Each structure stands twice: as structure tokens, then as C-alpha cells.
Design a binder for this molecule. Structure first.
Ligand SMILES: NC(=[NH2+])NCCC[C@H](N)C(=O)O
Length: 240
């Protein structure tokens, strides 16, 4: 019943994530080898360090991250996860570690074009399966052709190929794609967003002892501006 003691005993903290989402988590050539990096990984490492155990990152597609936590394949899920009311019915969440807006990534040549929701309504929109940006499009733009894709990298590949006109995603991720790729930009139009709902670490219910440790680490990061600093450092890394 003791999450903290169980983690200490096995000597590792297992964190489920989906590394398709720079600057939160993504793949980068460190040395040498492909490695999962990003602000969420630095935070997960801080939590593991506080507990005195090794960090083990378990990579999968986003739409299976919460399920893997729920069924015991990981101790925590950290994947830029919005702490929604719906999700709070099933999981407990840490205090928020970062709060951001939600944006559309488009072609630079189309920034003047997609100025309102009516214009997006007639566009081919992509979003990630099992996500808040996906739900928002379904709710607020029901008349749009929405393509739901498992992997965010594939959504962006479809945007680059011209099969998709706009991809809905967390703003820091859109900014990163725009900053690292010539033909891309963040649209000036955005959907109405669910008040509250910041990123938080997900845990199984009745994990109060582990939640306290996670909250302590997160509060210290926010107090020192460290999570912001982690995001800025991640932005200087190249993705695979
Ligand atoms: N690693 C990822 N692909 N994360 C996607 C997160 C999307 C959104 N913030 C959500 O919780 O639904």
C-alpha cells in the first residue's frame, strides 16, 4: 500500500511518457545514443533524485500513457498532461508544474489566412488522439474535417505534406516546431480554452504519500523558476 516504500524497494521510479512533444519530451542524440530528453524528463529526474532511486522512462504513444499508469506499468505519468476534471475522476494529480495556452501550427504562408475560427472550420485540422487539443476541436469546431493521429510527429508530417492545414497542440510545442522549421508558424487564432487545466503529474488514486513528494519537488522547481529554465534549455537541443 506504500507507494514510496515500494518505489524505494525496487530501486527505480518508472515514468510513462510520449516522446513526440518537444520541449516537454522528445528524442535527441546525446553523445552517442538516442535518448529521451525534455523539461518533463528533467523534472522526472528531480523527483527520482528526491526519492533516491533511478529514473526509468517508459516510452509509448500518448493515448496509452494514462492507461499504462492505471494498470500498473508505471508509477507516474508525465507527458505534458492536462489535469482535467474528467481525468481527475480516475487519477490523482500533482499540483500544476506548468500552465500554457493551446495553439494551431500552420504554414507560414497561411498565417494571414487563418485569422478566425470560421476560416479553420473549412480547413483540414489534425490533433492527437486522446488529447485536450483533440477534444477542443471536436467541441468547438464540429464542422471541421478533423484527422486524429496517434503520434504528434505524424500530424506535423501531414501538415508539411499539405494533407493537413493546421495542427492543434500545446503552445510551447507549436513554438518549438516553428522555431526549428522554416515553413511553419503559430496561427494568430486560438480556441476558447478550459479555464484551469495546467500540466500536472498523474498518479493512481490513493497515492498521497508519493503525491506529497512529487508536490514538494514541483513547488521547489516553480519557486526557483526551474521548470521554465528546463523548457528553455530543451529548446536548444536538436530532435531526431
Ligand atoms: N507527450 C504528448 N504527446 N503529450 C500530449 C499532451 C496533450 C494535452 N496537454 C493533453 O493532456 O491532452
Amino acid at each position: 500500500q506504500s507507494a514510496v516504500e515500494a518505489i524505494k524497494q525496487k530501486g527505480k521510479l518508472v515514468v510513462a511518457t510520449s516522446p513526440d512533444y518537444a520541449p516537454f519530451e522528445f528524442q535527441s542524440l546525446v553523445d552517442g545514443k538516442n535518448q529521451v530528453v525534455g523539461a518533463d524528463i528533467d523534472m522526472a529526474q528531480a523527483i527520482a533524485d528526491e526519492l533516491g532511486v533511478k529514473l526509468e522512462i517508459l516510452s509509448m504513444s500518448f493515448d496509452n500513457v494514462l492507461t499504462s499508469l492505471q494498470t500498473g506499468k508505471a508509477d507516474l505519468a508525465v507527458a505534458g498532461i492536462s489535469a482535467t476534471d474528467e481525468r481527475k475522476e480516475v487519477f490523482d494529480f500533482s499540483i500544476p508544474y506548468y500552465e500554457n495556452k493551446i495553439s494551431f501550427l500552420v504554414h507560414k504562408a497561411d498565417v494571414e489566412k487563418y485569422k478566425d475560427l470560421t476560416s479553420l472550420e473549412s480547413a483540414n485540422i489534425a490533433a492527437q488522439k486522446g488529447t485536450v487539443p483533440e477534444s477542443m476541436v471536436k467541441e468547438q469546431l464540429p464542422k471541421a474535417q478533423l484527422t486524429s493521429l496517434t503520434n504528434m510527429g505524424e500530424a506535423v508530417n501531414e501538415l508539411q505534406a499539405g494533407k493537413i492545414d493546421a495542427v492543434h497542440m500545446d503552445e510551447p510545442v507549436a513554438l518549438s516546431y516553428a522555431a526549428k522549421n522554416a515553413g511553419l508558424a503559430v496561427a494568430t487564432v486560438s480556441l476558447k480554452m478550459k479555464d484551469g487545466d495546467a500540466n500536472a503529474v498523474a498518479l493512481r488514486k490513493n497515492s498521497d504519500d508519493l503525491k506529497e513528494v512529487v508536490d514538494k519537488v514541483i513547488q521547489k522547481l516553480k519557486d526557483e523558476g526551474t521548470y521554465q529554465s528546463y523548457l528553455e534549455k530543451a529548446a536548444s537541443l536538436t530532435e531526431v
